[PDB]
Design a protein around this ligand. Structure first.
Ligand code: AXG
Length: 460
């Protein structure tokens, strides 16, 4: 049986509104309803991995697992295996996989983050799962962020707290947060960003939705506008939204949006919004293609509709050579030429780099760079041709060209990372100097840039 070079991944997010689900939820897993939907001819074809995020979930883990497994068995006639389940309050993530993948999946991690302080601590936060699928690391985050149209800044803060503090993936990647630890990272949930239009415009918004005219509404979606202004989810992608707002519905129908202020809402309006979202971030030049992104129309127990998204995701095999693992492959090397970091910091410490990659036996520390002043105020840290030659464990180009180098620039004085980024080894040529570039972030915000040239030697 050959190892796959592609898998498909289902992501679901549903705020269940503290109500049990209806007896049939198969449309969710089939990607059927509104938006970018899945072809009927694929209904019996199982996804490799199903990742289900719920919010306001009233069920026990056992109760929900039985519903999910019985749902997938009905669709596909396959009995899925439970990879992981993790719950914080009423926020839950379930990962299921086809039984043939059980020996391909390892290094399973779970964690949660509670957001807020005192008043704001007790129900919002995130759960997450990570694991390796053969040579590929996969991370999944289900977050329920702060509610209310006038709290977008709080949601942005909740995002930064979650990506700083959620402890998933390889703990050896100490300078790196979850936004750099995985080949593919999926972040989904009731992110709670709203359509920012005047309250008086509620009925106009409803009209637009009935006409399936979403453009003037999406142009006021807080998640899209905050992303465009680089306030949140920097370097994440989202598929185009072509489904109606998924919040806030009257229960037991989808004919009516319930937007008016009520004691039960704390006297807040809930204008129709795309609260329920799926975003992703994959390492550079890895295959990832969204093949569905939509909402169900027939699951009406909650004031939200379920959202689905599916993806093709490139994966690599667990490579063994006669040499690595457990030695280098002298036929392989990675050289950096003419490299410099441009940093937004006002500090005047010396900086060094760390290179981290699962193609190395361990991470590599550089010498200190040479600081200069950029023309527009900036710190430029020059490394020249001083950077250590990296010795990969395997030189075979079918392995090495699929790898990535994580880079951290660290203060000599504090050993704290000032910026993190990632370079693909999927080059146009080997034994050839080629430009490389990554933005650098810290706590998920832009802190600078790293650029230069690479020269990659493989056994071919
Ligand atoms: C570096 C440079 C360009 C991209 C592609 N886009 C990502 C999404 C942006 N966007 C966010 C909200 C509205 C647009 C546009 C550019 C990614 C990374």
């Amino acid at each position: 049986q050959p190892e796959p070079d592609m898998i498909t991944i289902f992501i679901g997010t549903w705020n269940m509104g503290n109500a049990p689900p209806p007896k049939k939820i198969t449309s969710w897993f089939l990607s059927k309803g509104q938006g970018k939907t899945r072809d009927d001819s694929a209904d019996y074809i199982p996804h490799d991995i199903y990742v289900i995020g719920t919010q306001e979930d009233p069920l026990s883990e056992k109760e929900w697992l039985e519903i999910l497994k019985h749902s997938l068995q009905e669709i596909t006639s396959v009995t899925f295996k439970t990879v992981a389940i993790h719950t914080l309050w009423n926020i839950r993530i379930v990962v299921l996989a086809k039984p043939e993948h059980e020996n391909r999946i390892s290094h399973i991690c779970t964690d949660n983050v509670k957001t807020g302080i005192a008043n704001t601590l007790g129900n919002k936060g995130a759960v997450g799962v990570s694991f390796m699928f053969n040579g590929t690391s996969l991370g999944f985050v289900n977050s329920h962020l702060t509610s209310g149209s006038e709290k977008k800044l709080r949601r942005n803060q909740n995002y930064m707290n979650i990506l700083r503090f959620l402890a998933l993936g390889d703990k050896k990647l100490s300078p790196f947060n979850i936004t750099h630890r995985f080949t593919h990272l999926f972040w989904f949930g009731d992110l709670n960003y709203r359509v920012d239009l005047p309250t008086w415009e509620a009925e106009t918004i409803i009209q637009k939705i009935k006409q399936q005219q979403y453009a003037d509404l999406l142009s006021h979606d807080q998640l899209l506008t905050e992303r465009r202004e680089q306030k949140v989810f920097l370097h994440f992608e989202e598929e185009e939204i072509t489904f109606a707002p998924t919040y806030r519905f009257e229960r037991l129908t989808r004919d009516k949006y319930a937007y008016t202020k009520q004691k039960a809402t704390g006297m807040k309006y809930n204008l129709p919004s795309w609260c329920d979202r799926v975003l992703w971030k994959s390492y550079p030049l890895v295959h990832v293609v969204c093949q569905s992104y939509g909402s169900t129309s027939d699951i009406m127990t909650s004031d939200h509709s379920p959202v689905f998204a599916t993806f093709e995701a490139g994966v690599t095999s667990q490579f063994v050579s006669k040499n690595g693992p457990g030695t280098v492959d002298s036929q392989g090397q990675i050289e950096f030429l003419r490299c410099y970091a441009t940093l937004k910091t006002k500090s005047q410490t010396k900086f060094y780099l760390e290179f981290h990659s699962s193609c190395l036996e361990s991470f590599v520390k550089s010498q200190e760079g040479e600081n200069e002043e950029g023309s527009e105020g900036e710190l430029v840290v020059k490394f020249g041709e001083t950077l250590p030659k990296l010795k990969p464990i395997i030189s075979d180009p079918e392995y090495l060209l699929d790898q990535h180098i994580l880079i951290s620039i660290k203060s000599s004085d504090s050993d704290e990372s000032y910026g993190e980024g990632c370079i693909a080894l999927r080059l146009e040529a080997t034994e050839t100097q080629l430009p490389i570039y990554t933005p650098l972030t810290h706590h998920g915000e832009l802190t600078g840039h790293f650029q230069g040239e690479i020269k990659l030697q493989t056994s071919q």
